[PDB]
Design a protein around this ligand. Structure first.
Ligand SMILES: Nc1ncnc2c1ncn2[C@@H]1O[C@H](COP(=O)(O)OP(=O)(O)OP(=O)(O)O)[C@@H](O)[C@H]1O
Ligand SMILES: Nc1ncnc2c1ncn2[C@@H]1O[C@H](COP(=O)(O)OP(=O)(O)OP(=O)(O)O)[C@@H](O)[C@H]1O
Ligand SMILES: [Mg+2]
Ligand SMILES: [Mg+2]
Ligand SMILES: [Mg+2]
Ligand SMILES: [Mg+2]
Ligand SMILES: [Mg+2]
Ligand SMILES: [Mg+2]
Lengths: 337, 322, 337, 322, 322, 337
């Protein structure tokens, strides 16, 4: 009906943390990962206090363990007042601007400048980010280049004239700086030059807090041939705080299936929950997530209400997973190109 | 008259009321597991409840992968948007490759504003954004267009019709396009995407020789559902040659049908279905209204399959250029 | 005198085929290649009937066997009514548009849309191709971008609005679709992404018939490292109909020299025809083609009329061929860079 | 209040009247040979007599290379221009990489035209030189701007203030940028440049595997003066943790200071100085105004260093993606 | 006075009425087989009957390849168009490399429209087709310009003068440029093209290490006629030193001529012809109007040939940079 | 005070050559390199006579031997009347023009066209180069594209219309051609295509004299994989005249230090001159050049006048050289990235 629908992270209302940042076993759409959600909440109090510039935290761990789910939990826990720029790591490879300029625009999008104006007397509020100020003052009719995105490289001299004016306003009280977050997911997709730009961009006084997520192991960096942990050089890994994410147990995988069967609005039998937890422990968590909705449609075509174990076994025979898919490809490897 | 192309006989999946696949219905023959799995996917696209789910059709070439997705497009009709897209289309000289993926992701979600008009989210994106040039449209524009479409739903002027994106030839994407597709499939506004590949256990482009199944990395293969497509039997090959003969208007004798079935199990399914129209033109050159075995035998001497041409290339490799 | 002169294919007036498509031994400037010209004529009746969309035929064979000569024979056998876009395989590598966009423009240039207009009453005829309609409707003053060639990438949304309008006209009878041919010579010079675009562009309802020529063997594809026949992947070779071309015999090489000595207007003696056929069988056909005109100028500088064997032997000593050229380079291989 | 970043405690080099380095002055602790060498460089930038001299700061990561150049920038003040620049900034899509080096070379030489205004040579370059675009500015313009600035000095309207260019991360330049830097440092108008690198015995980018120290070729290493930066002792690490605790406003007990000094000699200096603010937020969550050992011990279990995370990656390498 | 360059003494091929080459005529010395073969090519360019024929000049460096094609350009005169072109000119940033070849192919065909004016086909191409930019001109324009030039011939207003394209350094083309040159030489409007290379048995650029003679693929070497250029004897080297001394206005003694002939057979022909003007300037420094042996001996100690400099590089390879 | 200051070549007023081109042991800021300065002066008389087009001279030799110092000696010995374009070898890699077009603009910048105009009667003089004429006639408002540098590729047809007009003027006496020099320093940084453009650009009638400098040995060319002397192919090395530069002795290194201590205006003791010559012979010449100014500032902070040996030893302990720097890196090679 609306533009929004049931996505992969639509069940997560936030990190289920109490007053003492201690994580609850199942709260606000999140379950498991107790040291990772507690470290995410300490980073959440660091973002809400706004005092320290340029802090950086890597969320590392295995695929399917919820690195991105912790990041959209902290994204809904901030609210719309604090900016949260969420980019992919492949988005910096632009044809109209350099990777340094694309990372500088992603850095300056996350620093909100709340300007008030008293204008018989009404205080209009124009919250705006530092990137919009640099695009408006970059040229005449530059305010449509936020919209169409056809800004080139903004000059560095222009950015020092905006940073100085904003410092002046802030000391005169006309503006309030609300520093924010920059989530670079799949950061492993950045090259050595962009990682070395991150080595000096995080030392700036106006840098946002930089969260990053990587499922990669001790691999090669994209611009070079050396092997380093997480695909990230040790020169940048000196500047971060790693948050590991543990693989799930049986009861945690089963409780991810009950919070998801609710978001997709499907009523499942308890025997089908045990068989789907056994499927989700044998192969993958995300394969058992996508079996829930297609099992609900097999239950709708038989005109039942409760999803049985036979709907799970029929949809398990209908759609394969990499493991079984790769096996079948072994035979037609001379048929496959 | 309209031109007759490949997949012109495909008029939807051949399913009954119970959702099981018929052996021969609506131009589709065989492949019953893939057709019930594609019918469960059609029900998802119509439930209009989910977003960003991803399907991979996998199998050998010539096994009904583009045909099964065009049967999905015929079962949805023209009301649901469908956005076919080759995976080699992302290397534009004007914009970055993730912008070509994002513009195709917004092209597959439709809005019917009412006097009735049909528009996509990408049409509103280029309307609210000299030589014309494609521009890398920011997420700053896309969030307020999403708020404007949400206000258009709440006053009742508009109705959203989420659709499907077919990224045929998904192995031609590079590793940056797969890693942006992780974030693209994780959104609550993304269209249901059907990917297709026939390039099992090959290297990802953009990487220096790491190997994954289907040309797709294992971190994207975690997020998709696999539908395999098992090869056809001799009997079903003859039924495809019979359906392509009725679609192209070609009468055929049963002995020429048995000879074209032996030719199609000898080489491939596609070489025998392109032996139909040249044998029909040779039959109208001879003046006979139907194809006999001598027309298929003469046309099969005139045109070669790829394996016989590779045998000619292996026997005479010193003469050809390298 | 005129812009046109004696080129390499100017003697070919068409494929020498009779009513039953059976090839004549020497007719319309073509000689030899009887199964290849008969298969080319079956493809010529497929192009003239216009019914089946997206058919594709590869002309494979050895260099000098006349793959391109069969394609300019079918190009003059179509006439100017049916479009024939003849491109090289290296022409898709454009700096102003992508390889997908350059192949889409080469695909849509070969679909003619004949529009008539009744306008006391005179039916003006505006035959036009689908590419020109997409360039005119791409922008204001876009009709000069057919001329200067400064079109960028036409939007795909614009091409669906032209395809729908043309379908509407065709059903209303205002337009007549005349599908045509696209000759991609030296197709081996395309990369894997452009070959995979050909895998789906040929399945479209508006695709022209696609003829292609390759002299290559089992070689590597230009974008990858795998070896496949003709430099073309087996995923695209599944979609084609290969037409092999046989190497010539002695009498066929001699008759290529008599049809060419006529186009260049040179009168040669029969002993010089036997010596030039022996030269054309020993080294190459095309070397014996270029010895004819330079032998005619050696005969003009001695102020004779008939070209003798001594003019052939003098020009054979004057200009070398790769075989003899490579031998002489063997000695100065330490002198050559 | 102003945000507190890295190097916010650096308020200049800690030298006396004799030019020797103090052990702890102006936020700088230790590294006395590098601080007297940087004080001799500060005197050169102030003599305003030399042009194009080049300094390399070299050493391990986390040893005061960016901190020693920002101490040079605090000792010169805002009157002398300072132009920080990452070495990966030269790969612009608009202009060639030697133009990005030349625009940064002209940005670091200042002119005070008098009513008092501050301008650089690059500001006069873009003033005397639609979508705006950076342009490859010719020397033809730069020579007559140099004549106009020379006439502005001779009539007394202007006064030149040559400055300093910091090309941090100089190993990210390719071999063309080093070879243009040969001609750039040989000019009589060039600014004093301070280069920094921590990438000893690695290949030059833009070459196919030739190896030189610091990522810089030997023909550019002939033209620079080297300042090495020797690692810190356990005692000086604790003094850096004490100075970062007073800079961030954090009270700390002496036993938690000894535990953070053992943590900083166990892993690295930078991991222990980013354990300060999370332990302070855990102390205000518990309501105590100062950090004790239990807050550092709990926060050190929550966040990992890069070596412990690499040990987790080595023990479980079959589970992570490659 | 006009400047004197290399090939300034070349005033045409030295042929008589019978077409045989003289030993020394019109500034050309020796190489009689290549000069009769180039005279047969000159007759072809004048017959104005053929189109798209292609000539390769091949041989060692310093053997008269650029000199033999400029002798062709002097034998045709200024009435026939001549378009010299280096093969490295095709890598423009504005247009594709086949467009640079096609624009050079249309630049070499001339039209004299009559009050008399001289124009090329490329001049009509850019006339019938803000910052100016080169554009990839379509074949849609080129066909109606060919019809307009054909109508200009038929009403008698214009007369076509087909010319010659010299693609010197043809080994610097990549494999796409050779494969477009297949289609370019096969046209009936193409100019007669003279290619030149000195790079025997080297890899084609744009391919990963496949080897063909002269840097040109075997499928393009089928379409060209080869003219080899055999090295010069000691006697002809002295005649080139004598002709370059009369061209540059330099008087020379016979003993200095014998010493420069021994120097030119010791190193190369080109080093001895650039020892003429420095020995002449040393003779006017000493005040003598003619060069003696002491001037050639002193100037030969001042300047080195490439082989003696390579011997200095081999003896002292640890000191030079790599 | 002024835009100019003490650079690396600011002491060199010219080549110290007498009337007979014979070099003086120490004159005009130059010392040593007697065969190289005599060969540079013979090239200087070749540039001043202006008659022979397209001559080329390589200055080869070891680093620190003064190849560039000979080239700025000949640059100040020409004066401002004769043009001297001095470019780096990395400057041809432009994003707005090709390497051929950037070398053509660097070639045509060095050919001055002195135009006079009589305009009661006063002869105004507009000396201008051939590149400025090609930029002015390239487009309307093209005279600001010399300034901003936003010229693209000038058409070759336009350059033949300027070369013909300049030939016409020169024969009518309205213009005087003053050919000049093009110094391509670090020429080894050019690729094979740009070297092959130099093979034909030097044979033109309007080519300037081309001086080039290389410290490289028998190395690989930048565009290919073959090894050739100086990084330059033997096809281009056939066209040049190599000028070797000898390494310095003890007395020549000491006299470079006395001419430099004068330009930097530092008074040094003779024992410090012997110790600095021993340092300059042990490690490098340029390291001993940069120790002079920093030793003068150590002498200024002690409030002395004469620089002693202890200021040299203190600054020798303060700033390291590659040799000592590389040694210290050997230990922290596991600490360095
Ligand atoms: N802690 C959790 N609580 C609830 N649901 C979770 C949790 N972790 C994961 N999920 C579910 O599992 C899905 C996969 O998790 P997620 O995409 O965040 O993995 P990831 O660690 O980022 O892995 P990858 O590197 O493969 O992207 C989520 O979309 C969500 O539906
Ligand atoms: N003959 C000389 N007379 C005076 N000073 C000299 C001489 N040769 C070199 N110098 C001094 O030594 C410095 C280094 O010389 P120069 O830069 O010219 O070397 P180069 O041979 O070009 O080497 P590289 O290849 O390393 O650039 C010069 O800046 C100058 O100060
Ligand atoms: Mg994730
Ligand atoms: Mg398909
Ligand atoms: Mg051919
Ligand atoms: Mg740093
Ligand atoms: Mg030459
Ligand atoms: Mg130098």
């Amino acid at each position: 009906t609306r533009i929004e629908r049931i996505g992969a992270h639509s069940h997560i209302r936030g990190l289920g943390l109490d007053d003492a940042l201690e994580p609850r076993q199942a709260s606000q759409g999140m379950v498991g990962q107790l040291a990772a959600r507690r470290a995410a909440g300490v980073v959440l109090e660091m973002i809400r206090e706004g005092k320290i510039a340029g802090r950086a935290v890597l969320i590392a761990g295995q695929p399917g363990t919820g690195k991105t789910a912790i990041a959209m939990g902290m994204a809904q826990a901030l609210g719309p007042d604090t900016p949260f720029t969420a980019i992919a790591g492949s988005e910096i490879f632009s044809l109209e601007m350099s990777k340094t300029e694309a990372l500088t625009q992603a850095f300056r999008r996350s620093i909100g400048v709340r300007i008030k104006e008293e204008t018989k007397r009404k205080e209009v509020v124009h919250t705006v980010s530092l990137h919009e100020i640099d695009v408006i003052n970059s040229r005449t009719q530059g305010f449509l280049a936020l919209f169409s995105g056809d800004t080139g490289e903004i000059k560095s001299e222009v950015r020092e004239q905006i940073n100085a004016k904003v410092a002046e306003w802030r000391e005169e009280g006309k503006a309030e700086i609300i520093p924010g977050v920059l989530f670079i997911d799949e950061v492993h997709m950045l090259d050595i030059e962009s990682f070395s730009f991150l080595n000096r961009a995080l030392e700036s006084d106006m840098a946002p807090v930089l969260i990053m997520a990587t499922n990669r192991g001790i691999t090669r960096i994209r611009g070079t041939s050396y092997q380093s942990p997480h695909g990230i050089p040790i020169d940048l890994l000196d500047r971060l705080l790693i948050v590991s994410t543990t693989p799930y147990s049986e009861k945690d995988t089963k409780q991810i299936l009950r919070i998801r069967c609710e978001e997709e609005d499907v009523e499942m039998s308890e025997d089908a929950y045990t068989v789907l937890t056994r499927i989700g422990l044998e192969t993958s968590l995300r394969y058992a997530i996508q079996l829930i909705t297609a099992a609900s449609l097999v239950c709708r075509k038989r005109k039942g209400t409760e999803v049985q174990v036979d709907d799970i076994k029929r949809v398990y025979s209908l759609f394969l997973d990499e493991s079984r898919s790769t096996q079948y490809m072994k035979e037609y490897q001379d048929a496959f190109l | 008259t309209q031109r007759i192309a490949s997949h012109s006989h495909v008029k939807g999946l051949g399913l009954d009321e119970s959702g099981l696949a018929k052996q021969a219905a609506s131009g589709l023959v065989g492949q019953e597991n893939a057709r019930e799995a594609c019918g469960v996917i059609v029900e998802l696209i119509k439930s209009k409840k989910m977003a960003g789910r991803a399907v991979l059709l996998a199998g050998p070439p010539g096994t009904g992968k583009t045909a099964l997705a065009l049967a999905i497009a015929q079962e949805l009709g023209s009301k649901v948007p469908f956005c076919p897209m080759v995976g080699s289309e992302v290397y534009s000289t004007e914009i970055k490759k993730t912008e070509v993926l994002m513009e195709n992701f917004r092209r597959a979600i439709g809005l019917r504003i009412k006097i009735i008009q049909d528009v996509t989210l990408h049409d509103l994106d280029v309307a609210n954004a000299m030589k014309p040039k494609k521009t890398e449209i920011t997420d700053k524009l896309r969030g307020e267009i999403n708020k404007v479409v949400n206000k258009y739903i709440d006053q009742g002027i508009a109705e959203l019709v989420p659709g499907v994106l077919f990224v045929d030839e998904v192995h031609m994407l590079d590793i940056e396009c797969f890693t942006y597709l992780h974030r693209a499939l994780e959104s609550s506004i993304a269209p249901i995407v059907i990917f297709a590949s026939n390039r099992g256990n090959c290297v990802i482009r953009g990487t220096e020789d790491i190997t994954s199944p289907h040309g797709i990395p294992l971190d994207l293969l975690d997020r998709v559902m696999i539908i395999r497509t098992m090869l056809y039997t001799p009997q079903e090959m003859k039924q495809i040659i019979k359906i392509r003969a009725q679609t192209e208007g070609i009468n055929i004798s049963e002995e020429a049908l048995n000879h074209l079935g032996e030719i199609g199990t000898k080489t491939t399914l596609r070489y025998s279905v392109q032996l139909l129209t040249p044998a029909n033109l040779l039959a109208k050159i001879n003046g006979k209204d139907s194809i006999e075995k001598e027309h298929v035998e003469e046309i099969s001497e005139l045109f070669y399959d790829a394996k016989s041409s590779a045998k000619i290339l292996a026997d005479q490799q010193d003469k050809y250029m390298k």
